[PDB]
Design a protein around this ligand. Structure first.
Ligand SMILES: Nc1ncnc2c1ncn2[C@@H]1O[C@H](CSCC[C@H](N)C(=O)O)[C@@H](O)[C@H]1O
Ligand SMILES: CC(C)=CCC/C(C)=C/CSP(=O)(O)OP(=O)(O)O
Ligand SMILES: [Mg+2]
Length: 277
């Protein structure tokens, strides 16, 4: 039962989504991601752009960068093991959850507003025989069933732009144990630019989302017991992914808004990793 009209819009959006730039990339190795990539492009793997198999090599390379982005996120989760619970807040089709369970062996709990996504991820988990440890549910991430202090680490990978940040961080702070760890990778508008540019607004309109400024991320963390220990401006790191993607037949039309706003300083891609204290 949707918490607000807006969250009903978001459930409907993701229930309806199935773009090739997501499913064909996930098909490469069965890790289905809904986030962007980081790191240098492997031009050797790509080979000659004129080759018959170029588009398939581009697909494998873009997917490799999107998985690299998740790995980088998890490098900031600290240590976790089989007796711990990890929470993926706004978990998509569950590729990050699969990777986390492989990396840490923990119980991994995902929440999403989309029944089609939860169903997809739970089917994937059963296929991989890790469904006793990895579970998606349809649940608003601002109001979860996890007990106070029960969670060792948690994250939002490109899902914070659908909620009020004070409410989101109050919720993670509630369920994270003292000394637990939080990470987010997000696109935030740059308060140095001053307000959201036209490009940022085009991205909001495209995804029905609400990009926050970097100032708001840090303010909401400070107000909710979450203290950053690492912040990385990944903007230069994600541009190669976007410039490569822009050459792909699977483009969605938002590539220019990301590239141009990254280049002009109005928009930035950032990792913030924090302790719950
Ligand atoms: N209030 C809310 N509660 C739970 N999930 C939410 C939410 N608002 C948005 N979402 C989820 O946020 C996700 C954005 S897509 C990113 C998915 C995933 N973290 C990945 O990196 O692949 C979607 O799954 C959407 O359902
Ligand atoms: C501002 C940022 C970083 C993201 C905007 C919100 C959002 C849901 C982007 C979608 S990621 P995904 O569903 O994987 O999108 P596409 O590849 O189809 O463009
Ligand atoms: Mg995608």
């Amino acid at each position: 039962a949707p918490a607000t009209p807006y969250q009903e819009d978001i459930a409907r959006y993701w229930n309806n989504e199935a773009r090739p730039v997501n499913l064909r990339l996930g098909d490469v190795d069965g890790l289905y991601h809904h986030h962007y990539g980081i790191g240098p492009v492997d031009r050797a793997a790509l080979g000659d752009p004129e080759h018959s198999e170029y588009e398939k090599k581009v697909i494998a390379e873009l997917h490799r960068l999107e998985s690299a982005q998740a790995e980088f996120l998890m490098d900031h989760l600290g240590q976790a093991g089989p007796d711990d619970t990890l929470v993926d807040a706004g978990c998509g089709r569950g590729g990050s959850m699969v990777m986390a369970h492989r990396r840490f062996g923990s119980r991994v709990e995902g929440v999403t507003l989309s029944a089609a996504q939860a169903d997809f991820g739970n089917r994937r988990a059963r296929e991989l025989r890790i469904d006793d440890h990895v579970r998606s549910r349809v649940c608003n991430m601002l109001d979860t069933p996890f007990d106070k202090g029960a969670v060792t680490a948690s994250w939002n990978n490109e899902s914070t732009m659908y909620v009020d940040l004070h409410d989101l961080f109050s919720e993670h702070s509630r369920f994270l144990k003292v000394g637990g760890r939080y990470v987010t990778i997000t696109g935030c508008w740059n308060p140095r630019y001053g307000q959201p540019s036209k490009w940022v607004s085009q991205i909001n309109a495209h995804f029905e989302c609400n990009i926050h400024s970097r100032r708001e991320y840090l303010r909401a963390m400070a107000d909710n017991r979450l203290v950053p220990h690492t912040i990385v401006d990944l903007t230069p790191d994600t541009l190669p992914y976007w410039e490569l993607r822009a050459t792909s037949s699977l483009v969605t039309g938002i590539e220019k808004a990301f590239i141009e706003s990254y280049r002009d300083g109005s928009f930035q891609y950032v990792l913030i990793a924090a302790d719950r204290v």
